[PDB]
Design a protein around this ligand. Structure first.
Ligand SMILES: Nc1ncnc2c1ncn2[C@@H]1O[C@H](COP(=O)(O)OP(=O)(O)OP(=O)(O)O)[C@@H](O)[C@H]1O
Length: 664
């Protein structure tokens, strides 16, 4: 039903993906890798003391703080929405094998009963309106680049200088590239400006995943994670099979002679894709302005910061529904890509740019190493990009694509099941824009706060409110999908952007509050996704630059949690039992040390000043920059700090670029 061409590394098409240089060549050949992570300097994630500590802490917490989640997924009481067994993983050792990325998700969507286009004309208008509101009067900004980040295909450079070169060169030449593409000459576009090629697949770790303790056997059981084999991936699920990966860690004993205690498993791995930087630059140049716009003019539903920022908005609702989307990225519809490009073209965007955007969403994928002796295979032909993988985690505007979808999806869910009386307001593009604008500003009886697949759907007092309760009930029964676009459910233990929504006896938004998820603190402190990379001098280029700084923000981030104090004591106690040291002490040391090191990187920090003028956000980001691509944005981070992590291209240069893309 279209098989998707596949090419081995040795094929010329794959070879053209990697430049004549060491780094690039190595990335094309990189074989499957595995190994304990350096959790903290001097501490191996799989060290016996640590696993012991993990076994005791997880069992204890789970036993003394069972979840407090009602029939409707609202969490009350202790703020615990599940057991603490999630920490029981041999971090650094993946489940085998990782999945192969699906080349087409059309069958997948169809078999899941999702639509292959806007189903009604209203929907078609709202999606196009979303595009109109989001991409209009945009302001130029410098194109900020993450430090130590990669250029991926074809150079694989990590040099800031070279990145800036590439980017400037890209904004200068994007236009020729796109026109070349509009003429069907992708190979030329790629050969001449490296805009094309493929995404590079890298498997990332979900350091914690669900684990259950079956009362009968007294043995632990890990959530099975389904993966696809090469056959399945190239046939869109037609041929091939789709089985559960093995999380069994026993192998670690024979292979590496590591004592794997009972009830510990290999970690879940998620496919991640690095995009060809020459292609993402032109895109990022528009994407950031768009973020700025929606986070400013549409701050009500899009821009989120503190636990209280969220509280203000929800407290005022009569009903709060915490949604849940199944496998967002892989279901994301290509028809939406095409819809968006079409509308962009209508609004007046340079076709060459739109063409780049489009192409970035149908690009081939190079699979690295999903498992031992597996991979190094290119999926799809770069000469005629036509994959349909959903959303590529490393495309320049991934967050916007997920937010543009989902946001309209949720509104439609609301219109469809609770606010039929609003349809008359959506008659044509103008009325649609007018309506959406109002809605995104929190100015209607129905509201939402979201970021891609995370959302809190709300109802104020009114006509639609009775509908809202019916909807919530549809969700609890969970026998019927409330949407034609994506598989939707309610989150069991609702929370938004990391903070758990804590309901009291009343069980209503007004008397509820937003507390930090303490299980998150546990994940962050004992199951980091990456090691400390003590071998990297430049801390700014590390995945975790200043791990110690999180101690400083801990209270502010998680203090509001009902059993905050108890957990800390439990930790302290268990750490004593396992190390004969005080965890609090350990952290204060790490904290002093990192606070010191930091001043080296901050030009405005006295060479020994304090974390005096640093946001709690500043601290969490410095300890984990991942937070900067999922919880917050350039916006929420102090500019001092921002320069530590990012580096930009001249506004002069983006401004000139943007002026040629933008309609007006
Ligand atoms: N701190 C975090 N830890 C894990 N995932 C996170 C975290 N923060 C944000 N996410 C995200 O939320 C997602 C939703 O998780 P997931 O895809 O596994 O779905 P699920 O609801 O948990 O299970 P399933 O899809 O199999 O039905 C991820 O794909 C990821 O991008």
């Amino acid at each position: 039903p279209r098989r998707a061409p596949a090419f081995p590394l040795s094929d010329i098409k794959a070879q053209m993906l990697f430049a004549n240089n060491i780094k690039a060549q190595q990335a094309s050949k990189r074989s499957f890798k595995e190994g304990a992570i350096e959790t903290y300097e001097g501490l191996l994630s799989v060290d016996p003391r640590f696993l012991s500590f993990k076994n005791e802490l997880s069992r204890y917490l789970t036993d003394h703080f069972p979840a407090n989640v009602d029939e409707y997924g609202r969490v009350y009481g202790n703020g615990v929405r599940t057991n603490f067994f999630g920490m029981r993983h041999m971090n650094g050792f993946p489940m085998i094998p990782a999945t192969w990325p699906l080349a087409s998700n059309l069958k997948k969507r169809a078999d899941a009963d999702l639509a292959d286009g806007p189903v009604s004309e209203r929907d078609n208008l709202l999606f196009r309106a979303a595009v109109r509101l989001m991409f209009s009067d945009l302001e130029p900004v410098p194109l900020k680049i993450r430090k130590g980040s990669s250029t991926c295909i074809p150079y694989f450079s990590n040099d800031m200088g070279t990145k800036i070169e590439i980017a400037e060169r890209a904004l200068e030449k994007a236009e020729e590239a796109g026109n070349l593409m509009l003429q069907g000459k992708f190979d030329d576009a790629y050969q001449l400006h490296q805009m094309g090629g493929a995404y590079y697949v890298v498997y990332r770790a979900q350091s914690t995943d669900a684990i259950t303790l079956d009362p009968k056997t007294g043995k632990f059981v890990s959530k099975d994670r389904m993966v696809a084999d090469f056959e399945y991936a190239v046939t869109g699920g037609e041929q091939g099979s789709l089985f559960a990966a093995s999380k069994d860690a026993s192998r670690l004993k024979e292979q590496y002679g590591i004592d794997v205690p009972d009830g510990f498993f290999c970690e879940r791995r998620r496919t991640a894709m690095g995009g060809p930087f020459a292609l993402n630059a032109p895109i990022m140049a528009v994407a950031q302005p768009v973020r700025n716009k929606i986070y400013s003019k549409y701050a009500y539903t899009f821009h989120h910061t503190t636990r209280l920022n969220k509280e203000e908005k929800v407290k005022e609702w009569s009903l709060c529904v915490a949604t849940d989307v199944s496998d967002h990225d892989t279901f994301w519809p290509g028809w939406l890509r095409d819809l968006i490009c079409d509308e962009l073209l209508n609004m007046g965007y340079a076709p060459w740019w739109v063409k780049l955007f489009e192409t970035s969403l149908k690009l081939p994928v190079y699979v690295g190493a999903p498992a031992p002796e597996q991979g190094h295979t290119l999926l799809g032909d770069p000469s005629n990009p036509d994959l349909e993988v959903g959303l590529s985690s490393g495309q320049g505007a991934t967050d916007l694509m997920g937010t543009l979808l989902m946001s309209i999806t949720y509104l439609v869910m609301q219109l469809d099941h609770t606010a039929p009386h609003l349809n008359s307001r959506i008659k044509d593009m103008p009325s649609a824009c007018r309506f959406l604008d109002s809605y995104w500003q929190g100015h209607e009886e129905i509201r939402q706060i979201s970021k891609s697949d995370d959302a809190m759907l709300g109802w104020t007092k009114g006509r639609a409110l009775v509908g809202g309760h019916r909807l919530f009930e549809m969700l609890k029964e969970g026998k019927v999908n409330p949407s034609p676009y994506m598989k939707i459910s309610y989150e069991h233990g609702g929370a938004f952007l990391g903070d758990i929504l804590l309901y009291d006896s009343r069980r209503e938004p007004g008397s509820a509050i937003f507390v930090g998820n303490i299980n998150s603190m546990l994940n962050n402190q004992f199951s980091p996704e990456y090691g400390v990379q003590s071998g990297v001098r430049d801390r700014s280029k590390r995945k975790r630059p200043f791990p110690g700084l999180a101690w400083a923000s801990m209270k502010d981030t998680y203090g509001a949690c009902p059993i905050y104090s108890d957990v800390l004591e439990a930790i302290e106690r268990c750490w004593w039992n396992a190390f004969g040291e005080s965890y609090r002490a350990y952290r204060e040391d790490m904290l002093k040390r990192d606070t010191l090191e930091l001043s080296r990187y901050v030009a405005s920090m006295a060479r020994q000043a304090g974390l005096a003028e640093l946001t709690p956000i500043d601290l969490e980001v410095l300890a984990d920059p991942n937070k900067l691509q999922y919880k917050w944005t350039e916006a929420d981070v102090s500019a001092n700090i921002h320069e530590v992590l990012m580096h930009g291209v001249s506004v002069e240069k983006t401004e000139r670029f943007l002026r040629s893309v933008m309609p007006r």
